[PDB]
Amino acid sequence: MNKKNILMYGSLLHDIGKIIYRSGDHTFSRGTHSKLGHQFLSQFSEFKDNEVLDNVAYHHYKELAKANLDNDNTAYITYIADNIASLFNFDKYTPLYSVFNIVNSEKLKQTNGKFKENIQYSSGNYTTLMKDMSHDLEHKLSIKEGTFPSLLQWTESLWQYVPSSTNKNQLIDISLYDHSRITCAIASCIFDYLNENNIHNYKDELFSKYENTKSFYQKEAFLLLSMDMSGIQDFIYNISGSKALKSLRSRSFYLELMLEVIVDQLLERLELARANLLYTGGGHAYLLVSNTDKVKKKITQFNNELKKWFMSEFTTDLSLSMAFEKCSGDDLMNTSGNYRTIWRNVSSKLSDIKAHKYSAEDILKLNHFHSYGDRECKECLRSDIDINDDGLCSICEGIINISNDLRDKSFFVLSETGKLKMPFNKFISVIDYEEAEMLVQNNNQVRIYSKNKPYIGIGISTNLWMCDYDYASQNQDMREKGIGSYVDREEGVKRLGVVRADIDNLGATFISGIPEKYNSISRTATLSRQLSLFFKYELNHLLENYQITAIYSGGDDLFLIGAWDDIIEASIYINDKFKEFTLDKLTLSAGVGMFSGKYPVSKMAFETWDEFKKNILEEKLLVLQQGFSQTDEHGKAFIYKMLALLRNNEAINIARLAYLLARSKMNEDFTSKIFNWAQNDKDKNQLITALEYYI
Amino acid sequence: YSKIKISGTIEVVTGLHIGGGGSPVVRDLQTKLPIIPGSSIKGKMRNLLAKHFDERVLRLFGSSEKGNIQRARLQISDAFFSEKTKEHFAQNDIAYTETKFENTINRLTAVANPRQIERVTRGSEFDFVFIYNVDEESQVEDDFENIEKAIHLLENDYLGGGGTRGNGRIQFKDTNIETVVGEYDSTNLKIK
Amino acid sequence: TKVFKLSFKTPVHFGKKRLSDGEMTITADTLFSALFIETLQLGKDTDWLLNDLIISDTFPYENELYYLPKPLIKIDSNHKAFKKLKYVPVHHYNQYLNGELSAEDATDLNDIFNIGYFSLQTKVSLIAQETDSSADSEPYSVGTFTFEPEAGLYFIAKGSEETLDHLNNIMTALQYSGLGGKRNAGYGQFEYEIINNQQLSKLLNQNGKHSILLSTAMAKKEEIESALKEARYILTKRSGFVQSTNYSEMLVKKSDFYSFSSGSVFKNIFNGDIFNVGHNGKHPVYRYAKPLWLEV
Ligand SMILES: Nc1ncnc2c1ncn2[C@@H]1O[C@H](COP(=O)(O)OP(=O)(O)OP(=O)(O)O)[C@@H](O)[C@H]1O
Numbered sequence A: 001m002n003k004k005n006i007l008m009y010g011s012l013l014h015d016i017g018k019i020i021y022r023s024g025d026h027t028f029s030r031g032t033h034s035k036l037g038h039q040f041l042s043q044f045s046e047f048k049d050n051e052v053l054d055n056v057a058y059h060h061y062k063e064l065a066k067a068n069l070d071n072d073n074t075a076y077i078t079y080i081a082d083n084i085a086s087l088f089n090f091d092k093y094t095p096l097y098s099v100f101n102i103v104n105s106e107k108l109k110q111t112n113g114k115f116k117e118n119i120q121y122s123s124g125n126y127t128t129l130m131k132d133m134s135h136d137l138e139h140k141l142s143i144k145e146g147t148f149p150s151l152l153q154w155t156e157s158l159w160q161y162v163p164s165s166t167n168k169n170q171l172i173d174i175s176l177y178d179h180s181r182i183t184c185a186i187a188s189c190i191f192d193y194l195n196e197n198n199i200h201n202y203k204d205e206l207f208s209k210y211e212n213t214k215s216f217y218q219k220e221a222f223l224l225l226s227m228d229m230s231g232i233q234d235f236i237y238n239i240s241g242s243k244a245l246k247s248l249r250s251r252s253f254y255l256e257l258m259l260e261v262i263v264d265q266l267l268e269r270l271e272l273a274r275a276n277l278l279y280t281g282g283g284h285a286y287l288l289v290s291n292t293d294k295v296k297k298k299i300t301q302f303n304n305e306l307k308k309w310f311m312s313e314f315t316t317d318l319s320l321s322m323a324f325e326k327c328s329g330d331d332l333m334n335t336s337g338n339y340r341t342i343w344r345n346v347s348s349k350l351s352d353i354k355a356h357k358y359s360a361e362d363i364l365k366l367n368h369f370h371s372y373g374d375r376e377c378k379e380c381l382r383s384d385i386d387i388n389d390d391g392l393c394s395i396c397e398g399i400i401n402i403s404n405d406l407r408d409k410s411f412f413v414l415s416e417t418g419k420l421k422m423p424f425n426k427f428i429s430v431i432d433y434e435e436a437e438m439l440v441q442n443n444n445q446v447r448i449y450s451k452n453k454p455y456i457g458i459g460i461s462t463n464l465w466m467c468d469y470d471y472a473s474q475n476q477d478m479r480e481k482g483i484g485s486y487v488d489r490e491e492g493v494k495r496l497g498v499v500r501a502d503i504d505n506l507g508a509t510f511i512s513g514i515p516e517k518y519n520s521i522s523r524t525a526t527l528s529r530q531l532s533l534f535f536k537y538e539l540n541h542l543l544e545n546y547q548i549t550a551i552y553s554g555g556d557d558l559f560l561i562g563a564w565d566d567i568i569e570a571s572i573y574i575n576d577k578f579k580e581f582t583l584d585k586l587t588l589s590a591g592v593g594m595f596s597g598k599y600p601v602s603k604m605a606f607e608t609w610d611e612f613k614k615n616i617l618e619e620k621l622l623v624l625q626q627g628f629s630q631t632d633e634h635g636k637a638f639i640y641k642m643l644a645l646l647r648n649n650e651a652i653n654i655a656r657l658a659y660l661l662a663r664s665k666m667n668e669d670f671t672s673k674i675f676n677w678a679q680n681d682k683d684k685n686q687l688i689t690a691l692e693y694y695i
Numbered sequence B: 001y002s003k004i005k006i007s008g009t010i011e012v013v014t015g016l017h018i019g020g021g022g023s024p025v026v027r028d029l030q031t032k033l034p035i036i037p038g039s040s041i042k043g044k045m046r047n048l049l050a051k052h053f054d055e056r057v058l059r060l061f062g063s064s065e066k067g068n069i070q071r072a073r074l075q076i077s078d079a080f081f082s083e084k085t086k087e088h089f090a091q092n093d094i095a096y097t098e099t100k101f102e103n104t105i106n107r108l109t110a111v112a113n114p115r116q117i118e119r120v121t122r123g124s125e126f127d128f129v130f131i132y133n134v135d136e137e138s139q140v141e142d143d144f145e146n147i148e149k150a151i152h153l154l155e156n157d158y159l160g161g162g163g164t165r166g167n168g169r170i171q172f173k174d175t176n177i178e179t180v181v182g183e184y185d186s187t188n189l190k191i192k
Numbered sequence C: 001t002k003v004f005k006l007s008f009k010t011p012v013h014f015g016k017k018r019l020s021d022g023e024m025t026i027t028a029d030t031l032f033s034a035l036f037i038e039t040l041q042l043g044k045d046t047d048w049l050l051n052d053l054i055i056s057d058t059f060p061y062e063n064e065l066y067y068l069p070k071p072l073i074k075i076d077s078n079h080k081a082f083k084k085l086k087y088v089p090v091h092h093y094n095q096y097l098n099g100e101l102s103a104e105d106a107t108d109l110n111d112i113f114n115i116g117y118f119s120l121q122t123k124v125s126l127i128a129q130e131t132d133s134s135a136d137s138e139p140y141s142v143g144t145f146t147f148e149p150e151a152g153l154y155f156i157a158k159g160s161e162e163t164l165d166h167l168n169n170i171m172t173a174l175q176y177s178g179l180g181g182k183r184n185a186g187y188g189q190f191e192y193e194i195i196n197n198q199q200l201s202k203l204l205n206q207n208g209k210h211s212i213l214l215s216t217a218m219a220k221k222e223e224i225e226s227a228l229k230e231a232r233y234i235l236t237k238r239s240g241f242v243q244s245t246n247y248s249e250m251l252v253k254k255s256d257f258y259s260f261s262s263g264s265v266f267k268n269i270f271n272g273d274i275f276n277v278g279h280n281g282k283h284p285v286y287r288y289a290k291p292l293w294l295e296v
């Protein structure tokens, strides 16, 4: 095996022995984690590679003291990597803690919650996980050059809530999956930096003396890279046609998959692993790559090619900017909070290299092409693109095709023919799992992108996360239906609802984070993963009982559209369920408006807690609904006269409203409560809102 | 090249209903006073003056969609409540909008389903401005004859919805015609 | 070097891509186009007011506060509160250029920036077979903006005194035409007043090293290489149709043109030019690209 792949396959399993010791029913070597893990991996044909066994068995100082390994043996990089990612009585039942508590615990420290109140884990669980991983390791896992992403996926599937270090004296918030992933990432970066910079006897380069060791932490061997999609909003919100629902779910997905293919292709160029990706979503992506001249030269060339492409189709609507910054490993161990400095510095370099975007010859070429062009796509508000039948270009029709194909099929394939046009001379088509398999033994150079589906284990199984829900398919006709399919609800006015939400404390949370003591790469990485998985699974589950289709969701943007009443109810449910998952540390701000059917959705988008739930919805709305339910003949006329009196805030109007309520036939309690509320400004505004909701 | 200004005020003889909201009526989203759009004036005037007969219709309002292009020669703006109507309604304490309750009768069933349609108050006054871009000297007499006949027709017709059902009758008072650009005389042109 | 103040009293549609779109301010492209069309309608001579007049974009005002765009200058600290901000009044502009603006001040300035609101007015078109027989109406939408009783837009123009006298005459002609989209349907008339504000004059007549581009410009072919040495800028595809060029309006459409936005910052000044976007036409069609520089 390539020595880099040896680092990969060994590193990602360095602390495997922990799950084995913690098991207790699998403690063959009750001495140290290293020897036990070494013994466990040593029965299986595929992972019968020996140097991987050395890597796993020697991940710690004491063991390495006597292994007499070569001055070049991959395990040494593993040692430094685990140290970088990082009195010692490990309690096997230690419950994992959610990072979200600690984030804003500086202001308000709440009772540390935990995953599965005072929960505790038990021994047999680990034994079961041992069984499961032996099963997958005999039947699903196999060793080849290209299966490393699959190994990473299975680690992701099995370990995301098994605590990594169970030290009683440390704030336990790292899953073993996170520890393993970041260790593998750092190991890859170290290997490239050392191999490129003409050092081979790594035992003497690193391990020899702690002062020399400390220098290696100080050498700037790492580069952090950033990405940013420029023109999200105007590309996603330039729709006027009749397939508003169908396009938007598809345009949003096409842009998302564009970001994903860019990042994957870049990683392929730099010969790095999928682990080095730390965050994707929205338009940003962060990559941790090697600090070599080779890597930087490739990055410059790849930026050139990408920018030339994006000019060759869009020219203002979409562009990508990348920037990188030297950083030293000493900064990754939260030595002087300098992680925050370097992270802000790369952010500034990005925000200031999005200024100078086009060279001189570029802007000349943009302005001097006198070309015979037709006019603007009805669906896609764009002139430059070249229309065809029904006043639609080829790209918009491909978007419509992928829109039709979304609901029934789940796997997404990157191939040379496809349907939609992908950056580096590729295309996407759509298939099913049997078809995916058939492509797999065909050995086509393919990647599979899925609809939130693990347990794939198929070729390049890449469980990309995207919240695809639509109540429109729950009707008797499974085919996707238009925006009128929610308008035509008779339980209230035939109108639409749209909701937008932003995390208020998210800039600080990814940047400031937990102060002065938990600011490693590992801990911010796990926080990122937690927020991402929340917005890419939990929405799908939470939205089930609601007549809503999910448009764009992820990062910190929540964009859902559906029936009026349903949008309000789902918004309240989502706010509460979020406050649960963030342990009441992070807040959401959201806006919901009433928009009539058949409006150009590009135009409705540009228009768009405890108080509203407890005071308005729960008390006033309920008593009002009961009041009208008990007493008939109170049609929209009576309610609207109530409005007519209320909105004009005058005392003579208060007397008139008293007369009107007297002429009604409600129970004395209802009338009395209404009149008492009407006497008070806050209460009367709330009453106005509540009765307006009644209609 | 001169620009002729036709200004005046229009009274709502019977209640008016433009109802862009529907059944609300068009308003301004801050002042909360109703307005009467220029599009309404122009559309109804065009329909009437055309049904009266063409080239003149193309001349006054301009179509430019039939393989030849003609620029609009009459510009119509919106109208708004005058200060006089506002002060009068305030002093006498009159609301600005009336709401009429209506009803429908089914046949073979005789169950009534009611409606609720909002209507601008009788007596309200709207101030309007028209502009005439005289691009040809030798046609101003003809074009004001046409606009005279159009206004005469609108006097005897309705604006907005439900006019067959009894609303929208308007009146035109206090029209003055002044020349505001150029050196063309307008002391002989006439509009009721 | 006078400035013009525009009051409207009728809602205006200004447009970016579709008739249901609404925009608050417009650029020197549309302004210069309007002045040109009114000059031709008047039958006056066009050479004088072609190659001597410099116009800045439109910039909004409130009761007694005047506004200019945000310089895209590199401030080294949130990177959030400044992003949501577009315009900075004349009082605090030098403060912004020299870092004397604080985050709470940014929140306050944003809070005070209520200078108009947006709306969509619905309309129907019954010229269709509803005239003839059973046939649905075809509702369409328009996008409008309305200013509060003490808002509007303003210009900054400079040139010889004779050029400014001509500009005054043409503006008097224009105040009774429109400055927007659906002019003939009842949108966009205005009354204008010429006022000399001491502070804006002071701001315009400084001397510095940077430059803030207040209009939309594009350097000529032979100066762009040295023009773009150190700059921070945004490009905008500016498109649109033309009025009375060939037979079919739908067939005639200006070639797309890109120009720097109205906030870009430059080291080396460039003069602009009135660029043709013309082809397949009976007369040249002009687009405007000449900068009005603010030197600090
Ligand atoms: N497909 C999408 N549809 C809708 N919103 C999206 C989509 N992808 C991302 N977004 C959200 O839209 C927000 C606004 O994107 P925007 O156009 O402002 O781009 P940006 O990355 O912030 O660049 P810029 O700084 O130039 O504005 C993003 O921050 C993201 O949360």
Ligand SMILES: Nc1ncnc2c1ncn2[C@@H]1O[C@H](COP(=O)(O)OP(=O)(O)OP(=O)(O)O)[C@@H](O)[C@H]1O
Pocket (backbone or CB within 6 Å): A279, A281, A282, A283, A284, A502, A503, A504, A505, A506, A507, A508, A510, A528, A531, A532, A554, A555, A556, A557, C080
């Ligand atoms: N998990 C995340 N990790 C890192 N950055 C994130 C994450 N989620 C969202 N973001 C960032 O948030 C941006 C979205 O900006 P948006 O305007 O929606 O809100 P914001 O400015 O972050 O929020 P606020 O101003 O309320 O703090 C994305 O472009 C991205 O850079």
